[PDB]
């Protein structure tokens, strides 16, 4: 109850929940682009931009 | 580099240079791996 009530541990739960939701959208944006490559025009430069 | 082409490879370059510098600086700690060989100056055959 003191670990689950910590400010630090509740920041960490939200820091991980945001990291999960961001990598989830990174998976979805990767799949969307790799299906539609002819629209997407991805070229030959790696990186989220 | 108006295309950022080299930057895409920069992480792999730094990894291979640092792991090679590790291999060289693990190696140069070995016995006789630090001693310089005696040289004759002005030979017609090179010793480089």
């Amino acid at each position: 109850l003191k670990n689950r009530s910590s400010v630090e541990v509740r920041m960490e739960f939200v820091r991980q929940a945001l990291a999960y939701l961001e990598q989830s959208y990174k998976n979805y944006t990767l799949v969307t682009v790799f299906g539609n490559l002819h629209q997407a025009q991805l070229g030959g430069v790696p990186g989220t931009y | 580099d108006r295309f950022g082409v080299v930057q895409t490879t920069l992480p792999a370059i730094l990894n291979t240079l640092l792991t090679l510098q590790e291999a060289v600086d693990k190696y140069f700690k070995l016995p006789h791996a630090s001693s310089k060989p005696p040289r004759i100056s002005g030979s017609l055959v090179d010793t480089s």
């Binding site: - | 310089k36 040289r39 100056s41 480089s48």
Partner: protein, 383 residues
């Protein structure tokens, strides 16, 4: 430009502290081998000065100082501990050169050899062992007067007025490559351009030789009255400034870029231009006529190319023959200009013995001055 365009020297007892807004703010304080070194040393009185050489490290707040006892000392802004370098072959030190792209390597010119010191950058002991001092020498290349590393860190040059060949050294394979030419004298000073594509080499004669670092070619400059005394490259390597002993003149020589294939030729314009005169003028001051003019003994440019410092030496009719520091503001594009900025002055009775800029000062420029009092000053120029 000419000396008749400078602002007056500061009133007798004030010291120049810094440049700001383009103005110099003041306050109340902050031969044998040996006579042949004294003929070609960068220090205006190398035979009586306490300080024989100063050199900044090319990236960090570390500097090396050669003293009259043939110590080299090393100072660092993050160390109260000062290493004292003294080898058994270390005698009549003429030049110091730090290796670029290295925290830890210093070259020293001596009467009988070159010494390459290795210094452990975290563990700066007060007196490092004589094993930490790699010795380089060649029969006839003695005394050594000047040393110049390539900007890429992989090559070192050395000069000797006795020897009609620049010695290129690889310090890592321990090879020696003389560059012999066909008469003229030996070598007095050596200066790389910042690109590492060109090298100036001066001689005891009224001839200098510029060299190419790709094909190791040579381009000759023989229509001089006296010896080429000193010079400096622009930050781009496209211009070379030089001065002639007996002439009060700053010359400039341009080198356009290799927009073309298939030949090693050094590639300068067919002549120099004159850009500043240092003739024997008056300037009016609250303290009367002051008289200025003489011969430019040293010249040093900032890394930014916006400030040129010139160590003039007066004739024995002008300020008793004292040396003076002139500061010029420079422009390199589209035109090459030398504008005046002012006159740099120290402790009442001090004389400037050496000048040099800091290579990595993130607030305009920083001028190191070595004084005849044995003091070092560091004068920032804020721009």
């Amino acid at each position: 430009c000419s000396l008749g365009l400078f602002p007056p020297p500061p009133p007798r007892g004030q010291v120049t502290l810094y440049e700001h807004n383009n103005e110099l703010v003041t306050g109340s304080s902050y031969l044998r081998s040996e006579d042949l070194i004294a003929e070609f040393a960068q220090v205006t009185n190398w035979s009586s000065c306490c300080l024989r050489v100063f050199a900044w490290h090319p990236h960090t707040n570390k500097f090396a100082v050669a003293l009259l006892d043939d110590s080299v000392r090393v100072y660092n802004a993050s160390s109260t501990i000062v290493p004292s370098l003294k080898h058994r072959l270390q005698r009549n030190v003429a030049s110091l050169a730090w290796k670029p792209l290295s925290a830890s390597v210093l070259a020293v010119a001596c009467q009988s050899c070159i010494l390459i010191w290795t210094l452990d950058p975290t563990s700066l002991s007060t007196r490092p062992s004589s094993g930490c001092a790699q010795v380089l020498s060649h029969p006839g290349h003695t005394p050594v007067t000047s040393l110049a590393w390539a900007p890429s860190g992989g090559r070192l040059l050395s000069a000797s007025p006795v020897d009609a060949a620049i010695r290129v050294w690889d310090v890592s394979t321990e090879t020696c490559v003389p560059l012999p030419w066909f008469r003229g004298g030996g070598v007095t000073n050596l200066l790389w351009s910042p690109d590492g594509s060109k090298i100036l080499a001066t001689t005891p004669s009224a001839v200098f030789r510029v060299w190419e670092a790709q094909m190791w070619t040579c381009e000759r400059w023989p229509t001089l009255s006296g010896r080429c005394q000193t010079g400096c490259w622009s930050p781009d390597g496209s211009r070379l400034l030089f001065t002639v002993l007996g002439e009060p003149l700053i010359y400039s020589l341009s080198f356009p870029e290799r927009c073309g294939e298939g030949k090693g030729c050094v590639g300068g314009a067919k002549s120099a231009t004159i850009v500043a005169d240092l003739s024997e003028t008056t300037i009016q001051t609250p303290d009367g006529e002051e008289r200025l003019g003489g011969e430019a003994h040293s010249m040093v440019w900032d890394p930014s190319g916006e400030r040129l410092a010139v160590l003039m030496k007066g004739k024995p009719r002008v300020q008793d023959g004292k040396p003076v520091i002139l500061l010029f503001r420079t422009r390199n594009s589209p035109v090459f200009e030398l504008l005046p900025c002012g006159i740099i002055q120290g402790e009442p009775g001090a004389q400037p013995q050496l000048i040099t800029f800091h290579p990595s000062f993130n607030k305009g420029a920083l001028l190191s001055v070595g004084w005849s009092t044995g003091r070092i000053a560091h004068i920032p120029l804020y721009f």
